[PDB]
Amino acid sequence: ATYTLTLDKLGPTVNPTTSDAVTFTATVASPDSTTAVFFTLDYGDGVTAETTRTTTGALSTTPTANLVSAGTYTVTYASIGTKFVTLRLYDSAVAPGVLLASKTVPIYVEDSTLTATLLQSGVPRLNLAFSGFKGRVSSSTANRADMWATIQLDTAPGVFESSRIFIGIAPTASTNYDFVIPDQVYNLEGAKTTVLRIYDAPVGGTLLRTFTPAAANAVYVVDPSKYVLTLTVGPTSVTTADQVTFTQTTTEVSYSASATSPILQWRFNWDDPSVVETPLAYPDALTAASNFPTTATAVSSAAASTFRYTSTGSKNARLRLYDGANNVIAEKIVVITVSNAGYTLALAKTTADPVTTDDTIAFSAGAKHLSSTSQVWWTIDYGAGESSPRTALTMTNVGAAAPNAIASLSNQYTSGGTKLATLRIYDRDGVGANTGLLLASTTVTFTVTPVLYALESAVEPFSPIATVAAKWSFRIQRSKATPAGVTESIKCAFFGADTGTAPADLAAWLTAANGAGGLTATILPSSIPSDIISFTRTYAAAAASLQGKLQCFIGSTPLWDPYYPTPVFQVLAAAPTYTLSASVTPAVVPVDTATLWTYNIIRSVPVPAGGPSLPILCSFWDGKTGAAPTTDAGWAALAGSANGKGTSMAPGSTTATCSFTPSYSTTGTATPTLQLIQNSFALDAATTVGFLSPVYASYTISSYLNPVTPVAGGAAAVWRIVITRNAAVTASAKTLTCQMPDNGQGGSPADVTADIAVGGTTTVCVFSIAGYTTATPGPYFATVNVVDGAVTTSHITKNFTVLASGTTAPTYAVTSVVSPATPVKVSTPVTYTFTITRTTAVPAGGIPQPIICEFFNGEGTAADTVVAVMAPGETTTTCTFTTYYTTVSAGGFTAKLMVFGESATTPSQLLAAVHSFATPMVVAAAVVAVESTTISPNYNPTTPYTNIPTYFTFTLLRDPPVPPSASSGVQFACALYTGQNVNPASAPSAITDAVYKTFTDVTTAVATDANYFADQQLRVVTMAPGTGRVSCTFPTLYAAAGPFSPKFFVFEYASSTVGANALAVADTVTSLTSFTTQAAPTFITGPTNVPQRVPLPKGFRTTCFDGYELIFSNDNYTNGVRVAVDAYPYPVGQCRKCPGGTATMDGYRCIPCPSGYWSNEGARECTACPAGTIAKPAALTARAKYSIDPTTYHFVTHLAMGPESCKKCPKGYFQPNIAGTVCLPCPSGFVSTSGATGCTACSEGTYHTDGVGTTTPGEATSLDTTDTFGSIYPIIPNTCRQCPANTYLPLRGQAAIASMNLAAVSSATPCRPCEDGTWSKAGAAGCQKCPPGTYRNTWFSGQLGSPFITADGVPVATTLTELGSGCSQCPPGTYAPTFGMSVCLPCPAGTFASAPGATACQQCKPGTNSLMGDRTQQMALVVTNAANDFPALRAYTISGMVAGPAYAKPIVTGPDTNFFMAGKSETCSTNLPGYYTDVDGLPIQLPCKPGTFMPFDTATANLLDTGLTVDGTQCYTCQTGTFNDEFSQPVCKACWSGSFASKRGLPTCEIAQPGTFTNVAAAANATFNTATLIPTGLVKGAQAPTPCGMGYFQSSAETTTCTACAVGTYADQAGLAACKPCQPGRYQNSIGQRVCKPCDMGTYSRYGGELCTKCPAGTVASKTGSSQCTPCAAGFYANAPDSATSCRACPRGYYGPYSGAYADNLGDEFEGPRGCYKCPYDFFADRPGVRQCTACPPLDLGGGNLVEQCTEDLGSQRCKPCSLLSKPKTARTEQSPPPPSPSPPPPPPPSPRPPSPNPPSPRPPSPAPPSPNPPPTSPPPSPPPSPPPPRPPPPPPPPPSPPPPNRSPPPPPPASSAINPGGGVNQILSLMEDEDAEAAQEEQAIVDVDAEMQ
């Protein structure tokens, strides 16, 4: 029923070939029943075999293997294609069978001749065709047709048939044909039975070939998504410096799908084009076509690589897996970042300051990176190329730290060319020519300026001579000193423009330098010397061209640049001309004196321009010692010494001058000589150009002797002589000889030698003499004779009074007086006055004594020098000193005084003792007080600012008076404690400076060091002498408002030690008042800041210029037209025109210029109006309300109406200054009209005054001053007026003195009065002398009339003065011919002046005399004034005769008060009786001589001779008969009766001669009758002598009348001196008879004879006129008694002997006594006169007898006889004899002897000796001296130096990040136009500045 039969094949899955005979299997199962059934098998074709039916394993449902154990069922198929195998069932094996069913199975058989192979490159890609599949077919047969192949995806029925795919034709040849197979797509991820059948026919046919993957080569696809990669190799921030490391050990790739899977190649690429891609390398322990190990094995064992990146950027390295050849299936990227921005280069310079080429600059360069430390190369470039090795640098240090290790480098620079220095960094060595790229660069550049060389050129001859001399001297100097250890040598030459041509290149110069013509010089090391080179050239001919070029180069660097001028010189080429002249000033040649010697060098042609000044050197011979350089070597040495000076000229001068001031020590004829040398340096010789022939001290000696007053017994006198020389001693030492000439006694004084070194002028000579104490006082002369060189016998003598004091030694007393008294302060000037007196003081002015006084403190001696002169009058010597005590003594000071006689260079003491001060000396206490306190930065003076540093200033003074200028300054310490403890030091414990004394020295401290601002501060200030003020300034800062304790102390620093407290009471500080402190305003003061470049929209100009002002307004207010108002809602900047009164500069304000100028409306500068203006009108101010337009700042005082601006100042004022701050009234005596530069002086004789009167007023009126200038300038007196007459103004320019206070002192006319003696009219410079006869006086003036011309006699004042000049006259009768004499003198007597105007007093005529008073008034009875009668008086005062004992000479008696005689203003008076005048000349007043009378008048003459006439001028002598023995008698007194005058002109009465008498009955003296006042009753005396009458005579003198002559005596003739007696014999008994009557006869008369006398006795006369009667002869008797007429003889009887006999006649007429005696009786005589009577002779009677006769009667002649009538008759008596005659009378007694002469009177005694003259009166004490004037105050010291700015105001802040507005932030042609506009604007502004500057 059910049969299941399946037929299969037991062969391989691949289809069997035709040569294997594959077997087949049969499977039978019959579940319905089990029964053996035969099976028949049929192959593809039944023609081969049929086989036989055989049994299986009993059929059954279970197969049994069969047909192969013992069965020959081989098919041995021969055909190729498909064969059908048929299985059938039959019940029995014997034919016929039973047909039930058949199974058909196809079997494919192919041929091995065709071979199909596949080649696989790798895994075919999904969704893309892969070329790795290649199919090759090989056929042995030559001929083939086309084949077609069908491909089935799977053997499952789901896959449907595909179309054929073509594989080829192979038309011929048995080659191998290749085709490309399109890939397969993997989707199911499982087993695929993809089968391809290849047919040789398009339709039907047989299975030619088969295709399957066919094992051992299967495609295996790995899905990339399963892959896992982890690399993490290589640094993430590797730069180019480091390296990238790639390690294959850490990189693993795993299949991760199976253990066995085909081998792939890993590949990695660095994707840089420098290094090619790495090739595939054989893996270790692995190969190609090698199975992967079944365990975890690394694809690489230890492979690792390193790489260096040569490029920068983000590298994206690649990883891939490749199969077989270069076939790629996967690509993966690894990002490695390469950055080069981390490299930084820093350059730091340390040394800097590059100078010239030395001091090579060394700086540090550092390369830093953020990370990736690696080796690098640094290079430097300096214009010579970088280092080829690029050095070597290693980043051993870390990259975060700034410092980098490096080697310091230095560079050498030359010239000024750019070296383009740069620094480069590289990551590559560069040896392999792998140059790097720029990373950091950086560099430092500088301009490096070149150096300068100094060149000087000169010409040795200055004139090129042809082949003789052509030398050029060149000096080269190099900048900077050459350092030690390096020597610089420069070689080159100089080419002159004489031969050849200048080089056209520097190569020629280099060749010349290297050639033998070049010269080499060496610079000294460690110094910079001057290179001096002398170049010698040869000149063919003389030329004026001498320029040249030199180029010295060190190797290759030129030294000269075209910018400086090329070297061109002329310097006196060709030597045109050169001439000299010499002069001296002064021309005198004294001894040791300064003289000027000048030399002028001139040329005929002016020096050409462009030539250097002549370098010639002029040397002058001084001639001090006559060391004249005669040789040329000496001249060269003198020129090269200091005595030679180089010469230079100023530009524009052809001429040159050389000057010298030689001195002549010794007198000589030598004169200075000039040498002029300019050849070359190192002078050796001298050259002369020419010369010009010069064609045409005092010693003072004083001496002195010590002691001045010698003292007996003292020391020997010392004579000291000082000699001073006017000339300084510098050449050599001097020797002086002090001598005193020999006087012949006292010894020869010895010479004294004085030696003087350099600089000495005074020589002192000392000698000793012992005997000069015994020298006679007197004016002694001493001399010194000095001979010193040229001067000979310089003899100097002197005189001095030398006296000896005796034994008294003079001494000096010194006392003191002090100006300040007690007490004294510090720095107080003082006056110490010392007075010295001498107790003797005898030589007050005899001999000066040199006195010098020195006052010393307690220095310890016992320029401020003191000069002391000894007073030549009184010996009071005063010394003035100033001690200037200013310091505390600190131990005591003493005062000493020394007085000396030596001029400085003391050896001898003069004061007996050193003076000690009587006044106690007190130590002055110093006082100091603070004067002011100031705070500089402060809002108010009490409060300063906090943050701003403050400088407190304390100003104070040291004592009220300034410390003296002649002193040394003091050092003061100002100490301040700030008060806080902000400094580290704590607050001091003591308020005093106990801590402050320990401060260190603060001399060198900077302000900005935080210790110059310490809390405790000590500062030192200095008081220079003469300064009384000091300010100490303290820097103090206040951090914040709070408490501070700043202590202030001021002390004195002495010897760097702190003194005592300046203030009284210690710990006294003048603390400032307490204050708070407030914040400082941040305000800056300065000019308006100019805005920077800001965008200005349309017209917002921020600068106005040229008289314009910046103004903020929206209006476009052009000019003054009011065009635009409210023209914008927004104001803008505008330029305003400014008003007329203000000028502006660089307009930002419109400030006005000062009052001295006026401006225009828009004036750039203010014009200066001429000096006449101040421009000050009255004020009118400005706008009332802000409604009107504003113009200027509000504070201006004027608006600008009025073209008036310049206001001229009025008259009386002058403005010399151009500015005119104010116009000033000009000084006294000067006037101006309008406004003048200066007033003119007033004219002579004129002064300032008003011009209200007179004319041409100079006053300024009202309109000019009051209206224009207001009341600021009042009217001023401005007229010049001349003073009225009698006054004058000699000095020009004088003005009237005006006093404002008029009540007390009035205004004064300045004109001088023209005082006594001169007169003036109007204004005169000098008042004139006025005509003769006139004078002016200051007491009284005028003329008084002659009192005697008026009846009253009262003087009359007269006003007669000529109108020409006008001086008061002198009174008539007085004259003033003297020039300068004040009071008129009278004329001396002898003249008269009646005329009021008379030059001189006129002489009176000889007939009159100049007597006061007229003759009428002299004897006038008139009484002009009866009450007083003083003017009228009787002044004759004549004398007369008076009766009585008393006598009166004056007629008028009284004291005399008016006797003035010189006064004579009257007419000539009548000549006086006692005076006469004939001739002009009379020396002395002669009254009329006694014996001369002049009658008062002709009619009044009492008696005058008729033979002459009266002239009224001659004094006629007395007439005869009158005498005058007294002067001034009008008439001559007549002689009295007792005298007479008969001879002519007998001057005194002559005694009346005897015998004559003179008596005149009419003889009366003249009587002056008062009733007629006339002399009357004068009668002339007798003219001739009248002799006396008869009988009158007088023999005695002084007889008025002759007495009558005595009776009996007669004077026969008249005029008889004596009355002779009557002649003898004559008598005169009656008087009045002229003849004496003769006596009668017989009578005799004797002399006299009053009566006749009768002759007695007998005597008889008998003669008429008989003198006497003589007796007759004897014997005669008289006739009668008493009457005898004739005697007769007696009678004869009588006789008598007596001659005289008389008889009484009494009887007989004969008797009588003594008569004739009677003869006796008897006797007779008879004869008269006989002898005795004789008797008669006797008779004789016859002769015989004699008888005597007797006479009878008496007298009888006859004799008769007697005896009758005889004698006896009567009585008769006789007579006695007569008595004898009496004796003669005795002689008279002897006469007395004559008296003896009296002794003579004693002789007059000698005069007593005269008394000596009294001594002169004592001289008065000396008058007081003159006071000195004071001194002016010093000028104020200059203001303190201005401090530099402590700190500038806060600067504007810089931008930090930005400054933009608008809500800030929350997180071709146009360029040319802009450039053109900017350049044009800048150049226009520059032009504007340029124009404004000038």
Side-chain angles (χ1 to χ4, degrees), residues 1751-1757 1759-1773:
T1751 324
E1752 263 275 356
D1753 287 326
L1754 172 140
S1756 187
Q1757 309 109 280
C1759 325
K1760 32 189 313 299
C1762 36
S1763 80
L1764 67 163
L1765 309 164
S1766 45
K1767 332 283 199 42
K1769 65 157 154 287
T1770 170
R1772 264 296 300 191
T1773 78

Side-chain angles (χ1 to χ4, degrees), residues 339-344 369-370 439:
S339 155
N340 280 337
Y343 299 90
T344 58
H369 197 271
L370 320 170
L439 302 119

